[PDB]
């Protein structure tokens, strides 16, 4: 009876400003595991130019449950950006645990303003790299 119950996934998207993804198009991370015997599979999904018309000015960011042994899992999540010093910034966290099923995601449609992200003065794209950080806590398997 042993489980990975908390985990932090760090994802670097190189040459971010030159990403060709238009509105609605997704960038998908590699799959990562947790729970008992790697039985929970996750990934991240980002819309560099927003999910829809409302989020056009934003990067949209989601955590997707790919696979689980039962019907659902309930989990809290926090997304942030790592700056040039490797420090967390622009954090957003779920207000509570959310119900994930296979093929379902949860996240923030308006995670960060694109213009603020792209402005070199803000230091969020050092060497034009976006580093996203997702910390997950699983309440139930």
């Amino acid at each position: 009876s042993g489980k990975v119950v908390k985990f932090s996934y760090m994802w670097t998207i190189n040459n971010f400003s030159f990403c060709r993804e238009e509105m609605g198009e997704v960038i998908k991370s590699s799959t990562f595991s947790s729970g008992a015997n790697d039985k929970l599979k996750w990934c991240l999904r980002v819309n560099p130019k927003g999910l829809d018309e409302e989020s056009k000015d934003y990067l949209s960011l989601y955590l997707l449950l790919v696979s689980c042994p039962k019907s659902e899992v309930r989990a809290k999540f926090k997304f942030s950006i790592l700056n040039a010093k490797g420090e967390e910034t622009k954090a957003m966290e779920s207000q509570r645990a959310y119900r994930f099923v296979q093929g379902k995601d949860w996240g923030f449609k308006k995670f960060i303003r694109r213009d603020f992200l792209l402005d070199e003065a803000n230091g969020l794209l050092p060497d034009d790299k976006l580093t996203l950080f997702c910390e997950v806590s699983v309440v139930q398997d």
Partner: peptide
């Protein structure tokens, strides 16, 4: 912050 799903 308001969480939402992309489906």
């Amino acid at each position: 912050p308001e969480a939402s799903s992309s489906t």
